[PDB]
């Protein structure tokens, strides 16, 4: 399987 | 503010 | 199995 | 701010 | 298996 | 600020 | 099994 | 600031 | 098994 | 600051 | 087995 | 700062 | 087995 | 301040 | 087996 | 400051 997930939070 | 991300999952 | 993930959380 | 990520998983 | 993950939290 | 991150996992 | 992971938090 | 992290990982 | 993990933690 | 970390991790 | 681990902790 | 570091972990 | 870890704590 | 380290585990 | 680590704490 | 150091274990 395969997994790509980004999260790039600001504050 | 700027903001790059790139993902190339393979299965 | 993969697995990616990217996290640039800013204050 | 600047940002930068990439991620190229492989099965 | 694989796992690949970065995180660049700021403050 | 400037982040650079780079991942290619591989199974 | 292979795992790779990168955090460069900052305060 | 700056950052620059790289992981191959391989199975 | 193969593990590799980096951090780099700043105050 | 200056951040540079390279994983290469093989199985 | 293999392990590689780096920590750079800065105050 | 400086940070360098490289690790290859073979298994 | 093998074992590879690195710590520079800085204050 | 400047850092450098090189781990190469193998099995 | 093999063991390898490094500790250059700093105040 | 300045630190460098290398290991690389075999088994």
Same mark, same amino acid.
């Not at 399987?1 to 504050?11: D, G, K, Q, R, V």
């Given at each position: 399987?395969?997994?790509?997930? @980004? @999260? &790039?939070?600001? &504050?």
């Amino acid at each position: 399987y395969t997994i790509a997930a @980004l @999260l &790039s939070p600001y &504050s």
